[PDB]
């Protein structure tokens, strides 16, 4: 055939891939974390948006830290050979490097490590997208008028 | 408007 | 004939800059997710993903500013934070 370029990810596998949405709205009272009013609007918008991009969307609601880790582990052990990519959306409280389960924190590195090139071989070489709606600390941006 |  | 880094081919689309709060509207959803979904709907058949996310950065930065009765929290702004370890361009369409 003619000249070939390899500058873009192959996105014409039989499936676009999974889109896992973790929607944490209500937190255990003992944590003191506030309920995240509006997050259901986000979760519905994401489900529809990624549906129209032909992702297999799985919505999860109000997961403990243990459930988040087990979910990510199990998903990373699926056979993604026929999938072009992987998407995970995290909607929760957070601080720098951390997202909250309903009962306590999860290191973001623990979640993403399951999908490392050596640990999820059926996603090696494929784009792994993590979309994170969560705080990263407590600083406020005062802005500047233009 | 709320913070996360 | 070679290895790739185990950290290659990840993209982290953070709603806010390191160290910062992220803003969520109780009626409309979060500023970032509102904007991300709007830009994907408009541009996923047209633009490479980093350029989509740059439009999201612009929309969040330009179009949102919070209102609060609390002077500490009033009139603040947000910039999302695109963290790319990707090694290729990403288009959601093909062929």
């Amino acid at each position: 055939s003619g000249i070939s370029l390899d500058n873009s990810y192959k996105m014409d596998y039989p499936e676009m891939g999974l889109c896992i949405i973790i929607n944490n709205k209500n937190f255990h009272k003992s944590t003191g974390m506030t309920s995240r009013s509006g997050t259901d609007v986000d979760a519905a918008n994401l489900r529809e948006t990624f549906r129209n991009l032909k992702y297999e969307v799985r919505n999860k609601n109000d997961l403990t830290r243990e459930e988040i880790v087990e979910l990510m582990r199990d998903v990373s052990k699926e056979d993604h050979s026929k999938r072009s990519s992987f998407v995970c959306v995290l909607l929760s409280h957070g601080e720098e490097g951390i997202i909250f389960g309903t009962n306590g924190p999860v290191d973001l590195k623990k979640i993403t490590n399951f999908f490392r090139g050596d640990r999820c071989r059926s996603l090696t070489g494929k784009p792994k997208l993590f979309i994170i709606q969560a705080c990263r600390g407590t600083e406020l941006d005062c802005g500047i008028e233009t | 408007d709320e913070v996360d | 004939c070679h290895k790739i880094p185990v950290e290659a081919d990840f993209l982290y689309a953070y709603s806010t800059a390191p160290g910062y709060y992220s803003w969520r509207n109780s009626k409309d959803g979060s500023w970032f997710i509102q904007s991300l979904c709007a830009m994907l709907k408009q541009y996923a058949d047209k633009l490479e993903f980093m350029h989509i996310l740059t439009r999201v950065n612009r929309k969040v930065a330009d179009e949102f500013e919070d209102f609060s009765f609390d002077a500490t929290f009033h009139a603040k702004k947000q910039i999302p934070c695109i963290v790319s370890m990707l090694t290729k361009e990403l288009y959601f369409y093909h062929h």
Side-chain angles (χ1 to χ4, degrees), chain A residues 1-28 30-146, chain B, chain C residues 1-26 28-95:
Chain A
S1 57
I3 296 163
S4 66
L5 310 185
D6 194 13
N7 302 130
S8 56
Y9 287 110
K10 173 176 169 70
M11 296 296 288
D12 65 343
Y13 284 83
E15 303 168 29
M16 285 293 279
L18 307 188
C19 174
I20 308 298
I21 302 171
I22 302 179
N23 179 40
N24 277 2
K25 181 173 59 179
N26 291 307
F27 296 77
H28 288 203
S30 295
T31 68
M33 292 189 273
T34 61
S35 291
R36 294 180 61 262
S37 307
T39 192
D40 291 338
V41 179
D42 278 2
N45 203 357
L46 289 156
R47 180 178 185 80
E48 176 67 9
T49 297
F50 279 94
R51 183 186 78 84
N52 288 319
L53 298 180
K54 313 303 177 171
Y55 282 87
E56 175 182 339
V57 181
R58 302 183 192 162
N59 280 72
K60 306 289 182 215
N61 295 305
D62 291 343
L63 297 190
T64 64
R65 62 188 175 186
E66 292 89 4
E67 287 169 328
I68 291 178
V69 171
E70 285 323 285
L71 173 63
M72 293 289 105
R73 184 195 321 278
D74 293 347
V75 169
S76 76
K77 290 179 183 300
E78 292 184 19
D79 184 1
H80 302 262
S81 290
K82 294 170 161 42
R83 297 163 183 167
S84 298
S85 66
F86 175 71
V87 177
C88 176
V89 190
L90 302 167
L91 315 172
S92 197
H93 287 301
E95 55 182 14
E96 184 68 51
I98 288 159
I99 59 100
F100 281 90
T102 55
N103 63 337
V106 181
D107 279 358
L108 283 167
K109 284 293 294 187
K110 183 173 192 353
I111 289 162
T112 56
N113 272 352
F114 290 116
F115 300 88
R116 272 168 54 138
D118 58 342
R119 298 188 186 171
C120 184
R121 297 299 296 271
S122 61
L123 286 176
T124 310
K126 300 175 181 174
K128 299 165 270 284
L129 314 182
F130 290 82
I131 298 166
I132 309 108
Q133 168 58 41
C135 290
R136 301 183 71 186
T138 58
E139 291 180 63
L140 291 162
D141 191 313
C142 64
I144 180 65
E145 185 165 331
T146 54
Chain B
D1 300 306
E2 300 175 359
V3 291
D4 278 330
Chain C
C1 73
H2 71 292
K3 304 199 283 194
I4 64 165
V6 302
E7 298 276 8
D9 302 310
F10 286 80
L11 178 298
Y12 314 85
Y14 292 96
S15 67
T16 196
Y20 283 82
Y21 285 121
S22 183
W23 284 97
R24 166 181 38 76
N25 187 270
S26 59
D28 310 322
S30 69
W31 298 358
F32 174 65
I33 297 298
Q34 286 180 61
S35 300
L36 174 64
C37 290
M39 296 300 93
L40 284 167
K41 286 193 184 70
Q42 176 167 11
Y43 294 113
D45 60 346
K46 313 209 272 254
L47 298 186
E48 198 274 333
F49 190 37
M50 298 301 280
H51 291 171
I52 298 178
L53 289 177
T54 303
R55 304 281 194 116
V56 175
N57 278 6
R58 178 120 184 243
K59 187 168 184 61
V60 174
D62 281 355
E63 301 189 357
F64 296 85
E65 181 186 309
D66 79 279
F67 182 85
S68 177
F69 298 140
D70 185 337
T72 293
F73 284 80
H74 177 60
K76 307 298 178 183
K77 302 285 298 184
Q78 181 170 319
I79 184 74
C81 177
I82 307 160
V83 180
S84 176
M85 282 72 147
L86 299 183
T87 61
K88 296 180 182 170
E89 290 170 22
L90 203 166
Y91 301 87
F92 291 106
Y93 61 90
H94 67 273
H95 155 234

